Each structure stands twice: as structure tokens, then as C-alpha cells.
Design an enzyme around this catalytic site. Structure first.
Site, PDB file in Angstrom:
ATOM      1  N   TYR A  26      -4.038   5.706  16.320  1.00 28.31           N
ATOM      2  CA  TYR A  26      -4.890   4.619  15.191  1.00 28.31           C
ATOM      3  C   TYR A  26      -4.188   4.579  13.871  1.00 28.31           C
ATOM      4  O   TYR A  26      -3.953   3.748  13.247  1.00 28.31           O
ATOM      5  CB  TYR A  26      -6.200   4.908  15.084  1.00 28.31           C
ATOM      6  CG  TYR A  26      -7.027   4.669  16.357  1.00 28.31           C
ATOM      7  CD1 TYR A  26      -7.418   5.530  17.109  1.00 28.31           C
ATOM      8  CD2 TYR A  26      -7.519   3.341  16.296  1.00 28.31           C
ATOM      9  CE1 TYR A  26      -8.203   5.212  18.179  1.00 28.31           C
ATOM     10  CE2 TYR A  26      -8.385   3.098  17.427  1.00 28.31           C
ATOM     11  CZ  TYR A  26      -8.670   3.885  18.351  1.00 28.31           C
ATOM     12  OH  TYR A  26      -9.524   3.678  19.409  1.00 28.31           O
ATOM     13  N   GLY A  28      -1.272   4.109  11.217  1.00 27.13           N
ATOM     14  CA  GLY A  28      -0.006   3.407  11.184  1.00 27.13           C
ATOM     15  C   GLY A  28      -0.263   1.726  10.785  1.00 27.13           C
ATOM     16  O   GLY A  28      -1.359   1.487  11.228  1.00 27.13           O
ATOM     17  N   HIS A  50     -10.915   3.200   9.817  1.00 24.56           N
ATOM     18  CA  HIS A  50     -10.363   2.170   8.911  1.00 24.56           C
ATOM     19  C   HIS A  50     -10.071   0.977   9.512  1.00 24.56           C
ATOM     20  O   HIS A  50     -10.202   0.010   9.066  1.00 24.56           O
ATOM     21  CB  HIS A  50      -8.942   2.995   8.244  1.00 24.56           C
ATOM     22  CG  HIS A  50      -8.464   2.187   7.333  1.00 24.56           C
ATOM     23  ND1 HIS A  50      -7.312   1.250   7.576  1.00 24.56           N
ATOM     24  CD2 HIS A  50      -8.426   1.865   6.174  1.00 24.56           C
ATOM     25  CE1 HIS A  50      -7.096   0.572   6.511  1.00 24.56           C
ATOM     26  NE2 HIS A  50      -7.628   0.826   5.647  1.00 24.56           N
TER      27      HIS A  50
END
Ligand SMILES: CCCCCCCC(=O)O
Ligand SMILES: [Ca+2]
Length: 114
Positions: A26, A28, A50
Site C-alpha cells: 500500500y 507509495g 490512507h
């Protein structure tokens, strides 16, 4: 599609280069896990939340809640990381943190105008 163009692998690439960083499934920019994929560690879990937060706020990557929640999450990251993690947890988190702080400010500025 939903289960295309996404990761099912715990990555650890460009650990300290913000625009190219890929960590867990996740963490990046324009890099996220396939639906249902468990995050690889606590930091990866922060990023999972996020990515969806942005997704559910009209792809607003400057949403201040999404970004402030990420900072809170990052600051409280602990425990084992995934095996084969070529990155340093604390180091990578600090690189993400720097960028997200700037995102929070950018968001605040653009919303103090509206
Ligand atoms: C270091 C670049 C910042 C990556 C975007 C925030 C983490 C994520 O939720 O992917
Ligand atoms: Ca991501």
C-alpha cells in the site's frame, strides 16, 4: 476493473526516494493493494487506510483528514515488519511523513481560501 492494477506483494523498493517508493502492498504514490489484501506490517496498514480514505473522498489526495490521520498512524507504528523487507521501517516512515506534512499544509492553504 477492481482487482487489476494493484499489488498482492510486500514490496521494498526505492525506500528513500519519495516519488518512487514502494513499500508493502500500500505505501507509495499511485501504488495500492488489491481489494481484501492484508497489509504487510503496521506502516503498510497506515497506508492502506490512507489510500481508501483518498478513494472515498473524490480522489482528493489533499484531504486534510486523510493526511492528518496518516501522520497520527505513522507516529504510532511498531512491531515486526514483513520478512524480506529491504527497507528500514523508521527511515521509510520518516520519508512518507515529510511528504504528508507538506500535503497537510497544501490542503489547509487551499481550504482557507474556500
Ligand atoms: C513517500 C510518498 C508518499 C506516499 C503516499 C502516502 C502513503 C500511501 O498511503 O500510499
Ligand atoms: Ca499507496
Amino acid at each position: 476493473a477492481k482487482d487489476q492494477g494493484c499489488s498482492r506483494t510486500c514490496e521494498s523498493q526505492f525506500c528513500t526516494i519519495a516519488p518512487l517508493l514502494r513499500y508493502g502492498k500500500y505505501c507509495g504514490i499511485l501504488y495500492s493493494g488489491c481489494p481484501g489484501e492484508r497489509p504487510c506490517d503496521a506502516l503498510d496498514a497506515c497506508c492502506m487506510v490512507h489510500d481508501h480514505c483518498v478513494d472515498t473522498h473524490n480522489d482528493d489526495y489533499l484531504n486534510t483528514m486523510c493526511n492528518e490521520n496518516l501522520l497520527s498512524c505513522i507516529d504510532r507504528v511498531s512491531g515486526a515488519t514483513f520478512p524480506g523487507n529491504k527497507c528500514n521501517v523508521g527511515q521509510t516512515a520518516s520519508v512518507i511523513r515529510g511528504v504528508i506534512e507538506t500535503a497537510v499544509f497544501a490542503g489547509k492553504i487551499l481550504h482557507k481560501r474556500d
